[PDB]
């Protein structure tokens, strides 16, 4: 699945076309279902909601919103002082954190990071991803909820199986496809984070 | 708010009309927002989803589905062995548990139940409601998530204020209106639970 929906390579000008980006990331919310528990359903819903919101804005005028940069710059001009805590800019501000979670989690698994005492769990990998992508934007109650939910995570072997079901491939081949996916995905997420910095569109509030 | 949307009294035959029931309970999901935290948003969404699902079935043929009993009996006949774990029957099987939670929580608050050490919290009341209505249908991970989320609950004084905002009433008057609401609400929920028993439509699985 993951490598059937590669993100586009980054052009020299590092502009990310909105339409194709949304099409690519729209295949990611089911990722959380390969975890195999309803504890992950509200997570899938929040990420899906960001995508829907960005698409809704884009759809008002696909030309005006041709790139993600166009979204931020247009909304900055359209709105007053509520920006960047509004519209597709806010939706993408949160979406990028979820996309980063997925990135760091997968890279960690591919890099062979594991608890040597429990090498068939993915807790260490998910925890690292959470710390790096999301933790600092959650109050202590939400952080407590994450720690609890992590117990729902599947066995690594089963998780990787779920990502390749039907394909009849080895775990080694599965990890190769994940690595391929991570190239343009990681590059794209980095560019989005950098855009947020350049545009002064990043906010640090906790929920 | 609560007592502006009283449930209908129960007729002698204890049949509950589907249309008016759905109209009444459709005012309850915002209840969870008077708690004043996004930790409660996924809860509001699950309860809303049950309501939407029941309404969707009803809307296919309001006459056929005139009462909640009609829903169970019609679906039992329509479906095979997947019933009652299907359709509006399953949706109502879960909705009733949420409605019972709300009932027990409110009754507990009105009955003056409190932790004498922390009398302005509503933790004891919510915990009682959870134990009585939902706990046994949750695995340990979800139960852990509830304990954590309960820390998000507001102060009692603030919760009751939120329920009467704009009305300029005393807490004593607010509690009187809640008590009024609880009469036909409690009666109706009891009848639904009893119907589930009579129809052998209740399932005891955990999530
Ligand atoms: C009785 C049963 C037990 C109780 C159950 C309690 C449930 C606990 C629920 C915890 C929350 C679930 C996950 C959701 C988290 C979200 O609060 C945050 C912030 O969400 C943003 O809030 C914003 C609020 O706007 S503001 O008021 O103006 O500030 C916006 O709504 C924004 O959406 S937008 O499109 O409209 O722009 C929205 O994403 N979301 C996240 O943290 C992202 C979640 C991604 C997680 C990545 C994967 C990790 C999951 C663990 C996997 C091991
Ligand atoms: C990184 C961020 C941190 C991680 C966040 C993790 C999020 C944790 C989420 C925990 C779950 C949130 C609450 C939802 C609970 C639901 O799983 C259960 C069961 O739901 C049912 O499942 C069913 C599954 O069907 S089956 O597969 O065939 O079995 C159906 O989907 C059914 O819907 S239906 O309309 O389609 O029929 C549906 O209600 N719901 C509940 O427990 C009810 C929740 C009401 C709670 C009442 C208020 C208490 C809240 C605490 C307040 C102090």
Author numbering:
A (entry chain A), B (entry chain A): 3 to 209
Paper text:
Human glycolipid transfer protein (hsGLTP) forms the prototypical GLTP fold and is characterized by a broad transfer selectivity for glycosphingolipids (GSLs). In human GLTP, a glycolipid headgroup recognition centre located on the protein surface enables selective binding of the GSL head and ceramide amide groups via multiple specific interactions. Encapsulation of lipid chains within the hydrophobic pocket involves a cleft-like gating mechanism that results in two glycolipid-binding modes. To elucidate the structural dynamics of the GLTP–GSL dimer and associated adaptations, we comparatively analyzed nine novel crystal structures of wild-type GLTP (wtGLTP) and the sulfatide-specific mutants D48V and A47D/D48V complexed with N-lauroyl-containing monosulfatide (N-lauroyl-3-O-sulfo-galactosylceramide; hereafter referred to as 12:0 monoSF) and disulfatide (N-lauroyl-3,6-di-O-sulfo-galactosylceramide; hereafter referred to as 12:0 diSF) in different crystal forms and compared them with previously studied GLTP–24:1 monoSF complexes.
The protein structure displays no disturbance compared with wtGLTP complexed with monosulfatides. Hence, we can assume that the disulfatide found in the malaria parasite Plasmodium falciparum can also be bound by human GLTP. Indeed, careful comparison reveals some monomer–monomer′ contact redistribution in the dimer in the region of the α6–α6′ and α2–α2′ protein interactions and lipid–protein′ contacts. The crystals of the wtGLTP–disulfatide complex represent ‘open’ and ‘closed’ conformations of the dimeric arrangement. Interestingly, ligand adaptations also emerge with wtGLTP complexes bound with disulfatide. In contrast, the 6-O-sulfo group adopts different conformations/positions that depend on the protein (wild type or D48V) or the crystal type.
